[PDB]
Protein backbone atom coordinates (compact mmCIF):
# COMPACT_ATOMS: atom_id res chain seq x y z
CA UNK A 1 0.00 0.00 0.00
CA UNK A 2 0.90 3.68 0.25
CA UNK A 3 1.84 5.34 3.55
CA UNK A 4 -0.12 8.57 3.80
CA UNK A 5 2.55 10.56 5.62
CA UNK A 6 0.45 13.72 5.35
CA UNK A 7 -3.23 13.82 6.25
CA UNK A 8 -5.65 16.39 4.84
CA UNK A 9 -9.39 16.84 5.35
CA UNK A 10 -11.38 15.05 2.64
CA UNK A 11 -14.63 16.66 1.49
CA UNK A 12 -16.85 16.78 -1.58
CA UNK A 13 -20.40 17.01 -2.89
CA UNK A 14 -21.99 13.55 -2.85
CA UNK A 15 -25.47 12.21 -3.58
CA UNK A 16 -27.14 10.63 -0.54
CA UNK A 17 -30.20 8.40 -0.85
CA UNK A 18 -33.05 10.06 1.06
CA UNK A 19 -35.84 7.84 -0.25
CA UNK A 20 -37.34 6.08 -3.28
CA UNK A 21 -39.66 8.82 -4.54
CA UNK A 22 -37.00 11.52 -4.16
CA UNK A 23 -34.13 9.19 -4.97
CA UNK A 24 -30.71 10.85 -4.90
CA UNK A 25 -29.96 14.36 -3.66
CA UNK A 26 -26.69 16.27 -4.02
CA UNK A 27 -25.21 17.22 -0.64
CA UNK A 28 -21.97 18.31 1.03
CA UNK A 29 -19.78 15.95 3.05
CA UNK A 30 -16.75 16.45 5.29
CA UNK A 31 -14.52 13.67 6.62
CA UNK A 32 -12.88 13.99 10.03
CA UNK A 33 -9.46 12.32 10.25
CA UNK A 34 -8.86 13.74 13.72
CA UNK A 35 -12.08 12.49 15.31
CA UNK A 36 -12.87 9.83 12.73
CA UNK A 37 -16.52 10.69 12.13
CA UNK A 38 -18.22 11.19 8.77
CA UNK A 39 -20.72 14.06 8.80
CA UNK A 40 -22.84 15.70 6.11
CA UNK A 41 -24.77 18.95 5.65
CA UNK A 42 -27.55 19.98 3.27
CA UNK A 43 -24.92 22.11 1.54
CA UNK A 44 -21.55 23.83 1.94
CA UNK A 45 -23.22 26.95 3.34
CA UNK A 46 -24.02 24.73 6.32
CA UNK A 47 -20.47 24.14 7.55
CA UNK A 48 -20.55 25.84 10.95
CA UNK A 49 -24.23 24.93 11.31
CA UNK A 50 -25.23 21.75 13.14
CA UNK A 51 -24.84 18.56 11.06
CA UNK A 52 -27.84 16.50 9.96
CA UNK A 53 -26.26 13.16 10.80
CA UNK A 54 -23.00 11.41 11.66
CA UNK A 55 -21.66 7.93 10.89
CA UNK A 56 -18.83 6.12 12.68
CA UNK A 57 -16.04 4.81 10.44
CA UNK A 58 -13.96 3.04 13.09
CA UNK A 59 -14.58 -0.58 12.13
CA UNK A 60 -16.47 0.15 8.92
CA UNK A 61 -16.22 -1.43 5.47
CA UNK A 62 -16.26 0.20 2.04
CA UNK A 63 -17.96 -1.64 -0.82
CA UNK A 64 -17.65 0.19 -4.17
CA UNK A 65 -20.52 -0.83 -6.44
CA UNK A 66 -20.05 -1.54 -10.15
CA UNK A 67 -23.52 -0.54 -11.34
CA UNK A 68 -22.58 3.04 -12.19
CA UNK A 69 -19.19 4.63 -12.86
CA UNK A 70 -19.29 6.68 -9.66
CA UNK A 71 -20.82 4.74 -6.77
CA UNK A 72 -19.82 3.40 -3.35
CA UNK A 73 -21.24 2.43 0.04
CA UNK A 74 -19.89 3.06 3.54
CA UNK A 75 -20.86 0.34 6.02
CA UNK A 76 -20.53 0.56 9.80
CA UNK A 77 -19.51 -1.82 12.59
CA UNK A 78 -22.86 -1.07 14.23
CA UNK A 79 -24.98 -1.89 11.20
CA UNK A 80 -25.62 1.20 9.09
CA UNK A 81 -24.60 1.61 5.44
CA UNK A 82 -24.36 4.92 3.58
CA UNK A 83 -25.16 5.44 -0.10
CA UNK A 84 -23.09 8.20 -1.70
CA UNK A 85 -21.89 9.10 -5.20
CA UNK A 86 -18.51 10.64 -6.01
CA UNK A 87 -18.29 13.65 -8.32
CA UNK A 88 -16.51 11.62 -10.99
CA UNK A 89 -14.85 8.27 -11.67
CA UNK A 90 -11.52 9.69 -10.52
CA UNK A 91 -12.83 11.08 -7.24
CA UNK A 92 -14.45 7.72 -6.50
CA UNK A 93 -11.08 6.05 -5.94
CA UNK A 94 -10.10 8.97 -3.71
CA UNK A 95 -12.97 8.61 -1.24
CA UNK A 96 -13.09 4.81 -1.24
CA UNK A 97 -9.34 4.60 -0.64
CA UNK A 98 -9.05 7.50 1.81
CA UNK A 99 -11.93 6.14 3.89
CA UNK A 100 -10.85 2.51 3.61
CA UNK A 101 -7.72 3.77 5.35
CA UNK A 102 -9.49 5.93 7.93
CA UNK A 103 -11.71 3.03 8.98
CA UNK A 104 -8.65 0.87 9.62
CA UNK A 105 -6.06 3.40 10.79
CA UNK A 106 -8.66 4.13 13.47
CA UNK A 107 -10.23 0.79 14.36
CA UNK A 108 -6.64 -0.39 14.83
CA UNK A 109 -5.52 2.65 16.82
CA UNK A 110 -8.39 2.10 19.26
CA UNK A 111 -6.88 0.17 22.16
CA UNK A 112 -5.72 0.88 25.70
CA UNK A 113 -8.46 2.88 27.44
CA UNK A 114 -6.80 5.82 29.18
CA UNK A 115 -9.68 7.75 30.76
CA UNK A 116 -7.30 10.29 32.25
CA UNK A 117 -7.15 10.62 36.05
CA UNK A 118 -5.62 14.05 35.47
CA UNK A 119 -6.84 16.99 33.38
CA UNK A 120 -6.28 20.72 32.97
mmCIF file of C-alpha atoms in Angstrom:
data_model
loop_
_atom_site.group_PDB
_atom_site.id
_atom_site.type_symbol
_atom_site.label_atom_id
_atom_site.label_comp_id
_atom_site.label_asym_id
_atom_site.label_seq_id
_atom_site.Cartn_x
_atom_site.Cartn_y
_atom_site.Cartn_z
ATOM 1 C CA UNK A 1 0.000 0.000 0.000
ATOM 2 C CA UNK A 2 0.896 3.681 0.254
ATOM 3 C CA UNK A 3 1.839 5.335 3.546
ATOM 4 C CA UNK A 4 -0.121 8.571 3.803
ATOM 5 C CA UNK A 5 2.554 10.563 5.616
ATOM 6 C CA UNK A 6 0.448 13.720 5.355
ATOM 7 C CA UNK A 7 -3.233 13.825 6.254
ATOM 8 C CA UNK A 8 -5.647 16.393 4.842
ATOM 9 C CA UNK A 9 -9.391 16.839 5.346
ATOM 10 C CA UNK A 10 -11.381 15.047 2.644
ATOM 11 C CA UNK A 11 -14.625 16.659 1.489
ATOM 12 C CA UNK A 12 -16.846 16.784 -1.581
ATOM 13 C CA UNK A 13 -20.403 17.011 -2.885
ATOM 14 C CA UNK A 14 -21.990 13.553 -2.847
ATOM 15 C CA UNK A 15 -25.471 12.207 -3.579
ATOM 16 C CA UNK A 16 -27.136 10.633 -0.542
ATOM 17 C CA UNK A 17 -30.205 8.405 -0.846
ATOM 18 C CA UNK A 18 -33.050 10.060 1.057
ATOM 19 C CA UNK A 19 -35.843 7.836 -0.251
ATOM 20 C CA UNK A 20 -37.338 6.085 -3.280
ATOM 21 C CA UNK A 21 -39.658 8.821 -4.543
ATOM 22 C CA UNK A 22 -37.005 11.518 -4.160
ATOM 23 C CA UNK A 23 -34.127 9.186 -4.971
ATOM 24 C CA UNK A 24 -30.714 10.847 -4.900
ATOM 25 C CA UNK A 25 -29.955 14.362 -3.663
ATOM 26 C CA UNK A 26 -26.685 16.272 -4.017
ATOM 27 C CA UNK A 27 -25.207 17.219 -0.644
ATOM 28 C CA UNK A 28 -21.968 18.315 1.026
ATOM 29 C CA UNK A 29 -19.783 15.952 3.055
ATOM 30 C CA UNK A 30 -16.750 16.451 5.294
ATOM 31 C CA UNK A 31 -14.524 13.666 6.619
ATOM 32 C CA UNK A 32 -12.875 13.987 10.033
ATOM 33 C CA UNK A 33 -9.463 12.318 10.245
ATOM 34 C CA UNK A 34 -8.859 13.739 13.721
ATOM 35 C CA UNK A 35 -12.078 12.488 15.315
ATOM 36 C CA UNK A 36 -12.867 9.826 12.733
ATOM 37 C CA UNK A 37 -16.516 10.686 12.134
ATOM 38 C CA UNK A 38 -18.223 11.189 8.771
ATOM 39 C CA UNK A 39 -20.716 14.061 8.803
ATOM 40 C CA UNK A 40 -22.837 15.705 6.108
ATOM 41 C CA UNK A 41 -24.774 18.947 5.652
ATOM 42 C CA UNK A 42 -27.554 19.976 3.267
ATOM 43 C CA UNK A 43 -24.924 22.114 1.541
ATOM 44 C CA UNK A 44 -21.551 23.831 1.935
ATOM 45 C CA UNK A 45 -23.217 26.950 3.337
ATOM 46 C CA UNK A 46 -24.022 24.731 6.320
ATOM 47 C CA UNK A 47 -20.473 24.139 7.552
ATOM 48 C CA UNK A 48 -20.550 25.841 10.954
ATOM 49 C CA UNK A 49 -24.226 24.931 11.309
ATOM 50 C CA UNK A 50 -25.226 21.750 13.138
ATOM 51 C CA UNK A 51 -24.841 18.557 11.063
ATOM 52 C CA UNK A 52 -27.843 16.502 9.956
ATOM 53 C CA UNK A 53 -26.257 13.161 10.797
ATOM 54 C CA UNK A 54 -23.001 11.409 11.657
ATOM 55 C CA UNK A 55 -21.656 7.935 10.890
ATOM 56 C CA UNK A 56 -18.829 6.123 12.678
ATOM 57 C CA UNK A 57 -16.044 4.809 10.443
ATOM 58 C CA UNK A 58 -13.963 3.040 13.090
ATOM 59 C CA UNK A 59 -14.583 -0.576 12.133
ATOM 60 C CA UNK A 60 -16.470 0.151 8.920
ATOM 61 C CA UNK A 61 -16.225 -1.433 5.470
ATOM 62 C CA UNK A 62 -16.255 0.200 2.037
ATOM 63 C CA UNK A 63 -17.956 -1.643 -0.822
ATOM 64 C CA UNK A 64 -17.646 0.195 -4.166
ATOM 65 C CA UNK A 65 -20.516 -0.832 -6.442
ATOM 66 C CA UNK A 66 -20.046 -1.537 -10.149
ATOM 67 C CA UNK A 67 -23.521 -0.543 -11.340
ATOM 68 C CA UNK A 68 -22.582 3.043 -12.191
ATOM 69 C CA UNK A 69 -19.189 4.628 -12.860
ATOM 70 C CA UNK A 70 -19.289 6.681 -9.658
ATOM 71 C CA UNK A 71 -20.825 4.741 -6.768
ATOM 72 C CA UNK A 72 -19.825 3.402 -3.351
ATOM 73 C CA UNK A 73 -21.242 2.431 0.042
ATOM 74 C CA UNK A 74 -19.895 3.057 3.543
ATOM 75 C CA UNK A 75 -20.861 0.339 6.022
ATOM 76 C CA UNK A 76 -20.526 0.562 9.804
ATOM 77 C CA UNK A 77 -19.513 -1.821 12.589
ATOM 78 C CA UNK A 78 -22.858 -1.065 14.235
ATOM 79 C CA UNK A 79 -24.976 -1.887 11.199
ATOM 80 C CA UNK A 80 -25.617 1.202 9.087
ATOM 81 C CA UNK A 81 -24.604 1.609 5.443
ATOM 82 C CA UNK A 82 -24.362 4.915 3.581
ATOM 83 C CA UNK A 83 -25.163 5.444 -0.101
ATOM 84 C CA UNK A 84 -23.091 8.201 -1.704
ATOM 85 C CA UNK A 85 -21.891 9.102 -5.200
ATOM 86 C CA UNK A 86 -18.507 10.636 -6.011
ATOM 87 C CA UNK A 87 -18.291 13.655 -8.316
ATOM 88 C CA UNK A 88 -16.505 11.624 -10.990
ATOM 89 C CA UNK A 89 -14.851 8.267 -11.667
ATOM 90 C CA UNK A 90 -11.516 9.694 -10.524
ATOM 91 C CA UNK A 91 -12.835 11.081 -7.237
ATOM 92 C CA UNK A 92 -14.455 7.719 -6.504
ATOM 93 C CA UNK A 93 -11.081 6.051 -5.942
ATOM 94 C CA UNK A 94 -10.099 8.967 -3.706
ATOM 95 C CA UNK A 95 -12.970 8.610 -1.236
ATOM 96 C CA UNK A 96 -13.087 4.809 -1.239
ATOM 97 C CA UNK A 97 -9.337 4.599 -0.640
ATOM 98 C CA UNK A 98 -9.047 7.496 1.807
ATOM 99 C CA UNK A 99 -11.927 6.143 3.894
ATOM 100 C CA UNK A 100 -10.851 2.506 3.606
ATOM 101 C CA UNK A 101 -7.718 3.768 5.355
ATOM 102 C CA UNK A 102 -9.487 5.933 7.932
ATOM 103 C CA UNK A 103 -11.712 3.031 8.976
ATOM 104 C CA UNK A 104 -8.651 0.868 9.618
ATOM 105 C CA UNK A 105 -6.062 3.399 10.786
ATOM 106 C CA UNK A 106 -8.659 4.135 13.469
ATOM 107 C CA UNK A 107 -10.230 0.788 14.364
ATOM 108 C CA UNK A 108 -6.644 -0.390 14.827
ATOM 109 C CA UNK A 109 -5.520 2.649 16.821
ATOM 110 C CA UNK A 110 -8.386 2.100 19.258
ATOM 111 C CA UNK A 111 -6.884 0.175 22.158
ATOM 112 C CA UNK A 112 -5.723 0.879 25.703
ATOM 113 C CA UNK A 113 -8.455 2.880 27.437
ATOM 114 C CA UNK A 114 -6.799 5.825 29.185
ATOM 115 C CA UNK A 115 -9.682 7.748 30.756
ATOM 116 C CA UNK A 116 -7.297 10.289 32.248
ATOM 117 C CA UNK A 117 -7.153 10.620 36.051
ATOM 118 C CA UNK A 118 -5.620 14.053 35.470
ATOM 119 C CA UNK A 119 -6.840 16.991 33.383
ATOM 120 C CA UNK A 120 -6.278 20.717 32.967
#
